[PDB]
Structure 1
Amino acid sequence: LDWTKIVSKLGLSGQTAAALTSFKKRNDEAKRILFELKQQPSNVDFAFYKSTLKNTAIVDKIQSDVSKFTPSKANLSKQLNLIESFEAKALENAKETESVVLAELTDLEKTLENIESXXXXXXXXXXXXXXXXXXXXXXXXXXXX
């Protein structure tokens, strides 16, 4: 139950504010409807309805049909629109971090360990760190654009 993490789960764009507010309102209304309603069928007091009705065999026939089965507004799991989009979202957003965020962590560790170290050998290692820092600066401007 991520409360503070679900509000900041999106990126820098504010286009996901309408989709996140509609999903949170639908989940709260569905849980409140199940708690406000009774978690049972019905009483159906046939002991005081069959002997009090004017017509003979009136309340006895209606009590047997209501306690059997009837139709209800329900659906099946055939239209799995959210299940099909879950695999495509993880393969484009979550799977992109396995090659973009992983390459940035390996390049930052190699540049920090080389720029901090004697003369000609240290200058050669600093050249590779300078090239990685220049590429990181261009990637930082592209991430904000």
Structure 2
Amino acid sequence: AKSAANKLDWAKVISSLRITGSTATQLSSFKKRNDEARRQLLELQSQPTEVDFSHYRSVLKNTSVIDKIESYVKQYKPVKIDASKQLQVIESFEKHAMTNAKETESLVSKELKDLQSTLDNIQSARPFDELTVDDLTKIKPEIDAKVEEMVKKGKWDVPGYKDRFGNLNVM
């Protein structure tokens, strides 16, 4: 029954080459591993937790104490009940995780839809040799703002302009 849970956990781990740099996710992984290892060790080493009064008592002849310890064990059979205390704080962690997951997937879905729209537009709406400069100015007023700002400043240089564009300078 446990195979599916850790199978999907390590499937997420195999997906986790990209979220590297996490602090306690791997720490929580070794915590789960240590706890389940202690589980199986205690369950394997646990001999039948009862005195075999039929034989393991009959071998002792002058006990005078087997009855006392057996009565003590029988009186202490309900050693303690399970601690099912966590019913809201764990729910709080889950509601935070649900909120994060839903906002994440909304962001992802809208981003992929946007980027297929982007590639579809770029495929057949790319005026490499016929783009209008007036169209470029109208699309983005930021380049206009930059141009007037640098014109009124007097610094006619445009830093990083000979890096990719040649000069063919006769000088």
Pairwise CA RMSD of aligned residues? Answer: 3.7
Letter in 2 for 1:66: V
Aligned-pair CA distance for 1:91: 0.5
1:62 maps onto 2:52 in alignment: no
Secondary structure, aligned partner of 2:12:
coil
Unaligned runs of 5+ in 2: 1-6, 140-171
Shift of 1:48: 4.2
Say yes or no: does 1:5 pair with 2:12.
yes
Residue 108 (structure 2) pairs with residue 112 (structure 1): no
Give the 3-state SS of the residue equivalent to 2:86 in structure 1: coil
Distance 2:50 2:123 in 1: 79
Q: Could you say if the C-alpha distance between residues 74 and 106 of structure 1 is closer, same or farther in structure 2, counting changes exceeding 3 Å?
A: same
1:49 maps to which of 44, 57, 67: 57
CA shift, 1:85, in A, is 0.6
After TM superposition, the structure 1 stretch with the greater mean CA deviation from structure 2, 73-82 or 103-112, is 73-82
Spell out the pairing of 1:1-145 with structure 2 (5 A cutoff). 1=7, 2-3=9-10, 5-6=12-13, 8=16, 11=19, 14=21, 16-17=22-23, 19-37=24-42, 38=44, 41-46=48-53, 47-49=55-57, 51-55=60-64, 58-67=65-74, 69-72=77-80, 74-78=82-86, 80-92=88-100, 94-117=101-124
Give the structure-2-normalised TM-score: 0.52
**Runs of at least 4 residues off by over 6 Å:** none
Cα distance change on mapping 1:73 and 1:40 into 2, 3 Å = farther
Give 1:90 shift: 1.9
Higher relative CO (CA 8 A, sep ≥ 6), structure 1 or 2?
1
Larger C-alpha radius of gyration, 1 or 2? 2
Query: In 1, distance between residues paired with 2:122 and 2:25?
Result: 43
Q: How many residues align?
A: 119
Unmatched runs of 5 consecutive residues or more in structure 1: 132-145
Looking at structure 2, the residues matched to 20 and 74 of structure 1 have their Cα atoms a distance apart, in angstroms, of 27
SS of equivalent residue, structure 1 residue 113: helix
TM-score by length of 1: 0.59
